[PDB]
RNA sequence: GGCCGCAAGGUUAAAACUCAAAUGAAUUGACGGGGGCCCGCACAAGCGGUGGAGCAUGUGGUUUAAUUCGAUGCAACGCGAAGAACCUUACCUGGUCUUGACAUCCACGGAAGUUUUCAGAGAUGAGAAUGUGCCUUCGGGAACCGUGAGACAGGUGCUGCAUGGCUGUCGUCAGCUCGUGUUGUGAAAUGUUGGGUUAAGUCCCGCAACGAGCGCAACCCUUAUCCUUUGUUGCCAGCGGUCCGGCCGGGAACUCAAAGGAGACUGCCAGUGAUAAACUGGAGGAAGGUGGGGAUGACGUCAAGUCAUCAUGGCCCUUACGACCAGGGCUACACACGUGCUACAAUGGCGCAUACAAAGAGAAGCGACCUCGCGAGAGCAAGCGGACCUCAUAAAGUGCGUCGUAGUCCGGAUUGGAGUCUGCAACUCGACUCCAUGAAGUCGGAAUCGCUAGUAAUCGUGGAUCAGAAUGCCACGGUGAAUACGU
């Protein structure tokens, strides 16, 4: 992966960590029933002025050694190729070839 | 196969009566692994057939089979560049198997309402020497007769 | 055809692991990354001290690293100053207390990683590949391995068409799961591209 | 196991987690202190519930 | 040209020009509509499908501002993609920057929370608050921010016909080779062929051969029968309380959990065979002759696939083939092909009520009981990092009713109205719920595919990727066949 894509991911994580609480408060206002019926409108108009990259759904999981956007596994933080290389070298405790 | 010997599989007998013939008939009638449906159909058919003849279900069944068993058939050979029909004898297990298959195939094509009724009618016709199964036996024997020169 | 990895297929039968710790789903990936960075740092820093194996353990809330080497004097230095510098940098990388230990390799000619490294080093100085391979085989068999195999692949000697060559002595049974087989690889960077090297050493059944 | 298209040709791996439970019925202060002041191998996880 | 012949022709017999070879005998392979022997769902004996209909999904073509790049007979076409509304994204249109979005160096000044105006946003400007730690011998500036200049950074740009690594295939086929000796002027041969036997270059015997290596088999995982250790969160024959329920006191027997062990070797018996190797049958035994299923891929072949995972020789671009942003495209639509799902019905459709599983996942997660709504759901709130709590109600089945062969009480494409939830945001382009509508289609031309047993066929259940988005992929159990005369 190019060197700019990884930078994009780092920036996204930073902003999403910065604006976490404000979004939760505004979303609680919008969702909660028996509100003022005008505070709802104002919160809806306010939520869309925050930076777009603060929504956690703009993030994409990547391999931590190459940056690959496909074939990701969550337990290991790597893609299939690197998982296999490490496993055969013996660098993942408890893992081995299985049969049954 | 080429270098194999195949043994026989054990088949349980019928629960109501005690015959393996009837179990094989149920097996040939079943579809998609649903054996209870086939058992129900066969028992209904035999019950309705026993009243029409005043004899036992097994006896009626055997009477129906004895008019459908074949004796000789034809195989295909091609060694001189042409297809020839060669008559051969049929052994007993194959006689029974072919008779059962023809009876079920004939029944499925009838136009009565339920499968039990169709099977009962087909068995009665077979006992009286009528129907598609008996016509099939006749055709096979005719073809085997028209080729005795190649035995 | 293609062949299965010897070390991988033998894990848990006659070969041990290179990492030993227990973790859950929320620390597994972070631990793997920290191990990667530690090994990268040490491998860069000790490029001339004949390292062959880096074992890592994580007891409680600390990290302990064991280094297998053929030049323990060069690794330690004058009354441990070099080991201390390594310890401080590793502790900074990991984020927890660190401890470092040293183990000696008695016979460097029977170690698969070091043989491949020596062949690659010779190839980068314009030696003849047949000479290098034959010398490796002769040394290992003289010091008493039950068998050895060497393989080399690439643009050998500067040819335009690539090629693969190999040599073998003794026994190397790769289908027997109780055979103790050592295996490792290395790469060379020349003026014509990359050249690849593989080594197998056999030592007996268990 | 291939960097490009070959949809068969897979590998399958496994991890096994073993588990054990021990109970102490009638403790004493020295016993509990001794248990708390102990260290075991560096690949096992121990959880104590009082 | 001469001689001879009735003719057909015979006999004697040149040159110009052109090529760098033409030829004989033997050797190792490959091939034969040559011969001999042996194997495999290769035929034969059977069971169920694809090719016709509608829908899902990949490809060719055509269209477009763009419809991003790669895979191509078997061995590409539900393939890289284990999950394209923004992001991902590599493509198009327009708006922007030039030591740079991502690093190391030099030196001119200081950091991080909030909040107002103009932009589609990138990015421009105005303002309020703050004075960090720390040998300050004053030089610490490390931690992390602005600008300036230049060594430099940056490239999913080309060549898999320059390469490393990884993978497909012949093929889980039984083969492929070397040292010393001997034979031939030599290329080479023998061993490795021969008589039997085997799943097997597996084994015995013979023989100018004597030995060894890589493959075959065995050592690894799982499944089937026993016994000795420990018994909670798992288990109740015997005993005794009762609000009926393993609920409670208890018990260590059994089911089960998981560590050590036992067992299968042609070991025993008869017959055949070369005074053999082996073969056909029998006893006991949970299991018999490789008991069933996996992992395991020889020397080599196809300049086979991948410079877009990554790494890398040689070229090529640096106010641009390198950054940043909003909107669109990868979802187009006269057509042709591959892989699938649902059907065309009484071995069935609909209503009521009632048995019997295995294997998994879970803290920004799995979400019980109760209340509200026809429903998708909403509100309030226990428990669980788990043999304890939750996802979670198996379905086909069985019993009692109705439909009575009709394009139907079969099928469920399309299309109109009204809603729910995830998410800044569902127009292009999500999934799901209610009312209404109710298309093709009555078993599919020439071709053509899978399967030898707990298999085919049929029925449900779980996971990875993942805010949301499976008829695909990877696993789990229930019911349970037909046939193999033979080459």
Curated annotation (Swiss-Prot), chain A:
Domain of life: Bacteria
Quaternary context: Part of the 30S ribosomal subunit. Contacts proteins S3 and S10.
PROSITE patterns with a match to the protein in the record: RIBOSOMAL_S14
Family under the similarity heading: Belongs to the universal ribosomal protein uS14 family.
Role this protein plays: Binds 16S rRNA, required for the assembly of 30S particles and may also be responsible for determining the conformation of the 16S rRNA at the A site.
Origin organism lineage: Bacteria, Pseudomonadati, Pseudomonadota, Gammaproteobacteria, Enterobacterales
Protein name, UniProt field: Small ribosomal subunit protein uS14
One term under GO cellular component: small ribosomal subunit
From Swiss-Prot, chain B:
rRNA-binding in keyword set: yes
Keyword list, A-Z: Ribonucleoprotein, Ribosomal protein, RNA-binding, rRNA-binding, tRNA-binding
Cellular component aspect of the GO annotation: cytoplasm; cytosol; cytosolic small ribosomal subunit; membrane; ribosome
A molecular function (GO) term: mRNA binding
Domain of life: Bacteria
GO biological process: cytoplasmic translation; negative regulation of translation; ribosomal small subunit assembly; translation
Purpose: One of the primary rRNA binding proteins, it binds directly to 16S rRNA where it nucleates assembly of the head domain of the 30S subunit. Is located at the subunit interface close to the decoding center, where it has been shown to contact mRNA. Has been shown to contact tRNA in both the P and E sites; it probably blocks exit of the E site tRNA.
Subunit structure: Part of the 30S ribosomal subunit. Contacts proteins S9 and S11. Cross-links to IF3 and the P and E site tRNAs.
Family designation: Belongs to the universal ribosomal protein uS7 family.
Additional comment: The strain K12 sequence is shown.
Protein's UniProt name: Small ribosomal subunit protein uS7
Whole-protein residues included: 2 to 152 of 179
Curated annotation (Swiss-Prot), chain C:
Organism in which the protein naturally occurs: Escherichia coli (strain K12)
Keyword Translocase: no
Function summary: Binds the lower part of the 30S subunit head. Binds mRNA in the 70S ribosome, positioning it for translation.
The protein's name: Small ribosomal subunit protein uS3
Source taxon at top rank: Bacteria
A Pfam short name: KH_2
GO molecular function, one term: structural constituent of ribosome
A GO BP entry: cytoplasmic translation
Sequence similarity: Belongs to the universal ribosomal protein uS3 family.
Keywords: Ribonucleoprotein, Ribosomal protein, RNA-binding, rRNA-binding
Keyword RNA-binding attached: yes
GO CC aspect terms: cytoplasm; cytosol; cytosolic small ribosomal subunit
Subunit record text: Part of the 30S ribosomal subunit. Forms a tight complex with proteins uS10 and uS14. With proteins uS4 and uS5 encircles the mRNA as it enters the ribosome, which may play a role in mRNA helicase processivity. Some nascent polypeptide chains are able to cross-link to this protein in situ. In collided ribosomes contacts ribosome rescue factor SmrB.
InterPro entries linked: KH_dom, KH_dom-like_a/b, KH_dom_type_2, KH_sf_prok-type, Ribosomal_S3_C_sf, Ribosomal_uS3_bac-typ, Ribosomal_uS3_C, Ribosomal_uS3_CS
Location of the KH type-2 domain: 38-106
CDD domains from the UniProt entry: KH-II_30S_S3
SMART domains cross-referenced by the UniProt entry: KH
Curated annotation (Swiss-Prot), chain D:
Domain of life according to the entry: Bacteria
Annotated source species: Escherichia coli (strain K12)
Assembly notes: Part of the 30S ribosomal subunit. Can also form a heterodimer with the transcription antitermination protein NusB. Binding of S10 to NusB is mutually exclusive with its incorporation into the ribosome. The rRNA transcription and antitermination complex (rrnTAC) consists of RNAP, NusA, NusB, NusE (this protein), NusG, SubB, ribosomal protein S4, DNA and precursor rRNA; S4 is more flexible than other subunits.
Function: Involved in the binding of tRNA to the ribosomes. Part of the processive rRNA transcription and antitermination complex (rrnTAC). The complex forms an RNA-chaperone ring around the RNA exit tunnel of RNA polymerase (RNAP). It supports rapid transcription and antitermination of rRNA operons, cotranscriptional rRNA folding, and annealing of distal rRNA regions to allow correct ribosome biogenesis. In complex with NusB is involved in the regulation of ribosomal RNA (rRNA) biosynthesis by transcriptional antitermination.
Name of the protein: Small ribosomal subunit protein uS10
Family membership: Belongs to the universal ribosomal protein uS10 family.
Cysteine-cysteine disulfides: none
């Amino acid at each position: 992966a190019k060197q700019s894509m990884k930078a994009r991911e780092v920036k996204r994580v930073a902003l999403a960590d910065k604006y976490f609480a404000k979004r939760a408060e505004l979303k609680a206002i919008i969702s909660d029933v028996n509100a003022s019926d005008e505070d709802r409108w104002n919160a809806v108009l306010k939520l869309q002025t925050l930076p777009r990259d603060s929504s956690p759904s703009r993030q994409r999981n990547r391999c931590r050694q190459t940056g690959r956007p496909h074939g990701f596994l969550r337990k290991f933080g790597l893609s299939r190729i690197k998982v296999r290389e490490a496993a055969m070298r013996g660098e993942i405790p408890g893992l081995k070839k299985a049969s049954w | 196969p080429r270098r194999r010997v195949i043994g026989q599989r054990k088949i349980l007998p019928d629960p109501k009566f005690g015959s393996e013939l009837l179990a094989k008939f149920v097996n040939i009638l079943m579809v998609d692994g649903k054996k209870s449906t086939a058992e129900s159909i066969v028992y209904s058919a035999l019950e309705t057939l026993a009243q029409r003849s005043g004899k036992s279900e097994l006896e009626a069944f055997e009477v129906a089979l004895e008019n459908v068993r074949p004796t000789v058939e034809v195989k295909s050979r091609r060694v001189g560049g042409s297809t020839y029909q060669v008559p051969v004898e049929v052994r007993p297990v194959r006689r029974n198997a072919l008779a059962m298959r023809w009876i079920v195939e004939a029944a499925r094509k009838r136009g009565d309402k339920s499968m039990a009724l169709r099977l009962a009618n087909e068995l009665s016709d077979a006992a009286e020497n009528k129907g598609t199964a008996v016509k099939k036996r006749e055709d096979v024997h005719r073809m085997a007769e028209a080729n005795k020169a190649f035995a | 055809g293609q062949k299965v990895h010897p070390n991988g297929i033998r894990l848990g039968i006659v070969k041990p692991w290179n990492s030993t710790w227990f973790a859950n789903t929320k620390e597994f990936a972070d631990n793997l990354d920290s191990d990667f960075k530690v090994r990268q740092y040490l491998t860069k820093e000790l490029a001339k001290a004949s390292v062959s194996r880096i074992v890592i353990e994580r007891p409680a809330k600390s990290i302990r690293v064991t280094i297998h080497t053929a030049r323990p004097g060069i690794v330690i230095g004058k009354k441990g100053e070099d080991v201390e510098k390594l310890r401080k940098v590793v502790a900074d990388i990991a984020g927890v207390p660190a401890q470092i230990n040293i183990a000696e390799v008695r016979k460097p000619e029977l170690d698969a990683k070091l043989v491949a490294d020596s062949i690659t080093s010779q190839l980068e100085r314009r030696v003849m590949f047949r000479r290098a391979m034959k010398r490796a085989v002769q040394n290992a068999m003289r010091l008493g391995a039950k068998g050895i195999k060497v393989e080399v692949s690439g643009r050998l000697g500067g040819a335009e068409i690539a090629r693969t060559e190999w040599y073998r002595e003794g026994r190397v049974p790769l289908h027997t799961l109780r055979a103790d087989i050592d295996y490792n690889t290395s790469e060379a960077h020349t003026t014509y591209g990359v050249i690849g090297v593989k080594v197998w050493i056999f030592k007996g059944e268990i | 196991i291939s960097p490009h298209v070959n949809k068969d040709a897979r590998d399958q791996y496994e991890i096994r987690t073993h588990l054990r439970l021990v109970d102490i019925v009638e403790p004493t202060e020295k016993t509990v202190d001794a248990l708390m002041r102990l260290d075991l191998a560096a690949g096992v996880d121990v959880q104590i519930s009082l």
